[PDB]
Amino acid sequence: GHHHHHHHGESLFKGPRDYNPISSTICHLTNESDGHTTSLYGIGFGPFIITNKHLFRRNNGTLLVQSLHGVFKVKNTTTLQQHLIDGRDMIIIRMPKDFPPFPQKLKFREPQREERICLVTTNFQTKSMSSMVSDTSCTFPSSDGIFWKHWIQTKDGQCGSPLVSTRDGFIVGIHSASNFTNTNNYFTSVPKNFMELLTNQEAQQWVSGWRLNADSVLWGGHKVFMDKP
C-alpha cells in the first residue's frame, strides 16, 4: 500500500534471504498419551529440540519426532531430559544420543519493538520436506514481553514455528497462541541470554517426567487455555 519516495537505496526492503538453514532444523512433534495426541513443531539445535512447554500438558506416552533425517520415536516420554524456561511457553528437550544431532549455526535473540518478522515452517507431507515463509508482520510486546503480538495468519498445529527477523535472520520466538477469534496472534519470545543457555551446560537445569497439571495457565499476563471453546 505504500509507494516509496525521497528515499535512500538503503531504505528499501531487505532482499532475498535463505531460510532453508532454519527450516532444515524444524521438527514435527507428536506427544501421544492417555488417549490424547498433541502435535506441533520444534527447532533443532545440537542435541536439543526447542519447542512449546505446552507440548507437555501430558507426559506419560510416546513422542514421534519427524525431521530432515527421518522419523524417530521416543518410547517413553518420561525418560526425556527437559529444561524449562521460567514463566514462558518454552522448553528445551535433550534428545537421546541415538537421535541424529542438529547443527549449531542458528542465532536467537530477544525481539525488538516494531521490527519486521516472518514465520518459517517446513512442509513434511511433501516426500521431501520443503521450507515455507510467510508474509511479514511488525511485532510488539504484550505486557511484560513474555508473549509478543504478531499478525501472521497461522493454522491450527503451527505452534513452535520460529518467528524470524527479516533484518538479520535471527529467530526471536516461537508461535504459541491466538485469541478466541483468531484475530490477534501471539508468540513466546526468546528470553534474554538464550545463546548462553544453549551453549553452556552450567546454565542448563535438566529434569525429566515434567508436565503441566491444568487446562489453562497464567503466563505473561494472559490466561491461556489448552483448547479453544
Partner: peptide
Amino acid sequence: EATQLMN
C-alpha cells in the same frame, strides 16, 4: 516408518 530410539 519410525525408527524406535533406545529409550
